[PDB]
């Protein structure tokens, strides 16, 4: 960690995926991935990937989480970016809530690595 | 069923992430996530997420695989998208090879669910 990476835009339109965070420039951490948009009558959007760290000792960006869905599946969370050098890996995004929940995103490698995210929350009839 | 125009773009510059696959429209499978680009000097990019299946009975899209790296970490593989209805979940992508190899992507939910991907190989010596 020293300079910033460019974050990815969150999805906004129905079911739209988040955009990836950018790979860091020199001495820059990777950008955070965008969140996926909610889905209405359709599944949620996927998260966008977290960016890899740039040259030097840089951290990976966090992966975006997936969007929730009202009647369908959540979007999946995106992976975190890997570190540069001796930096820390990005945390994976969480899946969106839905039926069923989206899968989690993996952590990016580093020293230490980032953790994978959580699956999205699901609702069950009793 | 596979529909046109849903696959995410592959990364095309050093370390760039793959783009996520698009959520399917009605009766369409989710799109495949893009492949992460390799890294030279820095880490590989992670793969893009697979899109969720559309309404009806649809398959989730496969997650993209991560890029390799020469001296740094491989990019992570991406999660597969969830099925719609009674469809099959998408397969998770594979991690890129590197120091160490990237984490695998999780499978998407379905009946049956997608399998997780393979970790990237860790290169030594």
- Say what the resolution is, in angstroms: 1.2
Percent helix, strand and coil across chain B, each rounded to 5? Answer: 0, 5, 95
Contact B104, B95 (CB under 8 A): yes
Please state, in angstroms and rounded to a whole number, the distance separating the CA atoms of residues A34 and A48. Answer: 5
Chain A neighbours among B 10-29 (CB < 8 Å)? 13-25
CA distance A21 to chain B (A): 8
Please state, in angstroms and rounded to a whole number, the distance separating the CA atoms of residues B58 and B38. Answer: 32
* Tokens read off for B98: 């590197």
Closest among B116, B78, B114, B115 to B96, alpha carbons compared: B78
Closest among A56, A48, A47, A69 to A24, alpha carbons compared: A56
- Residue written as token pair 């209805």: B85
Beta bridge partners of A98: A122
Please state, in angstroms and rounded to a whole number, the distance separating the CA atoms of residues A117 and A98. Answer: 16
Please state, in angstroms and rounded to a whole number, the distance separating the CA atoms of residues B77 and A78. Answer: 9
Beta bridge partners of A69: A39
Closest among B125, B114, B123, B29 to B77, alpha carbons compared: B114
**Residue A28 three-state SS:** strand
Instruction: Look at the alpha carbons of A20, A4, B120, A104 in this order and tell me if their dihedral is positive or negative.
Output: negative
DSSP state of A63: P
Contact A114, A107 (CB under 8 A): yes
Q: Is the peptide bond before A30 cis (omega within 30 degrees of 0)?
A: no
Count of other CB atoms within 10 angstroms of residue A31: 28
A44 shares contact with chain B (CB less than 8 Å):
yes
B69 shares contact with chain A (CB less than 8 Å):
yes
Instruction: Look at the alpha carbons of A57, A3, A67, B13 in this order and tell me if their dihedral is positive or negative.
Output: negative
Facing residue for A42 by CB, picked from B19, B23, B46: B23
Facing residue for B53 by CB, picked from A21, A43, A52: A43
The full set of domain ranges for chain A reads 1-126
Query: In degrees rounded to 5, what are phi and psi of residue B63?
Result: -75, 145
Q: Is the peptide bond before A112 cis (omega within 30 degrees of 0)?
A: yes
CA-based diameter of chain A, in Å?
54
Percent helix, strand and coil across chain A, each rounded to 5? Answer: 0, 5, 95
Q: Do A79 and B46 touch (CB under 8 A)?
A: yes
Technique used by the depositors: X-ray
């Amino acid at each position: 960690m020293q300079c910033d990476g460019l974050d990815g835009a969150d999805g906004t339109s129905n079911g739209q995926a988040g955009a990836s965070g950018l790979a860091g420039g020199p001495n820059c951490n990777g950008g955070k991935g965008g969140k996926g948009a909610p889905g209405v009558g359709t599944a949620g959007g996927a998260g966008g990937v977290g960016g890899a760290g740039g040259t030097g000792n840089t951290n990976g960006g966090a992966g975006g989480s997936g969007g929730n869905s009202d009647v369908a599946a959540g979007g999946a969370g995106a992976a975190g970016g890997a570190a540069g050098g001796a930096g820390t890996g990005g945390t994976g995004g969480n899946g969106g809530a839905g039926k069923p929940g989206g899968a989690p995103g993996a952590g990016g490698a580093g020293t230490p690595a980032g953790s994978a995210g959580s699956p999205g929350q699901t609702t069950v009839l009793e």
